[PDB]
Design a protein around this ligand. Structure first.
Ligand code: VX2
Length: 273
């Protein structure tokens, strides 16, 4: 029984993803998050080896298991008459990247590098496990303030990774690629790299580069903040108009701007504590 083994706390937020509450496992006081999703609003369903129909996020979070702390952990899930309830890991103290950027403004490159690097390791893990997130953005990134470790969250718009074209999409438009905007077609990896380019720009400039569809398809990048030449280069590369012109994950991590990243704990001590 859900309501029994978990003590519900205040509402942390709600929106397209549903409603998320703070909570604690009555068992051992472990802090958790309780996410409720209405059955009538599920964009993509999946099936487990059982044959049980469930929200994609459940299938996806089960596929990316491992002590790897770069991806939020799914502790348990329950099905209700008209909804599903997911019990997720909850770091404390924590702050999503969006709020962090909002309060601090553009991030120093050293910090942005550490954060971007951890996001890349997390995405590579998902891909290696056959999982495509499809909604990479600051709002979907949690920061474990004490350890300086980032967690990718909300795989509700994700899908199993495939080598063929995707014609469906329910992620965030301003983070979606030109090919999706113009043709409603995109491939997994190259689309992910574009969103990562949007994310990196967001980190070093304090806001996203494109607002309107016309800007996304034109892909002309203008820096409103002082950004190094090497960082500018990596960003423009990730945002290449032609999908095949974008760097692979390996190329991104071997890029000059990505060398000598700080360790998570060093990151916390220098920029978070
Ligand atoms: F940290 C936290 F909140 F306990 C937590 C822990 C683990 C997972 C999830 C989770 N899974 N999906 C979504 C979609 C949106 C969203 N938005 C929040 C993000 C923080 C601030 C309040 C709104 N969280 N989320 C949230």
């Amino acid at each position: 029984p859900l309501e029994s083994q978990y003590q519900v706390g205040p509402l942390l937020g709600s929106g397209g993803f549903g409603s998320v509450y703070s909570g604690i496992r009555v068992s051992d006081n472990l802090p958790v998050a309780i996410k409720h999703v209405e059955k009538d609003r599920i964009s993509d369903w999946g099936e487990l080896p059982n044959g049980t129909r469930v929200p994609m996020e459940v299938v996806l979070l089960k596929k990316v298991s491992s002590g790897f702390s770069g991806v939020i952990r799914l502790l348990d899930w329950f099905e209700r008459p008209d909804s599903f309830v997911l019990i997720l890991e909850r770091p404390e103290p924590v702050q999503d990247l969006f709020d962090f950027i909002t309060e601090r403004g553009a991030l120093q490159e050293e910090l942005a590098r550490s954060f971007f690097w951890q996001v890349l390791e997390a995405v590579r893990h998902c891909h290696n496990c056959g999982v495509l997130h499809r909604d990479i953005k600051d709002e979907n990134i949690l920061i474990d303030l004490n350890r300086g470790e980032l967690k990718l969250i909300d795989f509700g718009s994700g899908a199993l990774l495939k080598d063929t074209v995707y014609t469906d999409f329910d992620g965030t438009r301003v983070y979606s690629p030109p090919e999706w905007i113009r043709y409603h077609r995109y491939h997994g990896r190259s689309a992910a790299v574009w969103s990562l380019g949007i994310l990196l720009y967001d980190m070093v400039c304090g806001d996203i580069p494109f607002e309107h569809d016309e800007e996304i398809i034109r892909g002309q990048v203008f820096f409103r903040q002082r950004v190094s030449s090497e960082c500018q280069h990596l960003i423009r590369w990730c945002l290449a108009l032609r999908p095949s012109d974008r760097p692979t994950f390996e190329e991104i991590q071997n890029h000059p701007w990505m060398q000598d990243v700080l360790l998570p704990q060093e990151t916390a001590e220098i920029h978070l504590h």
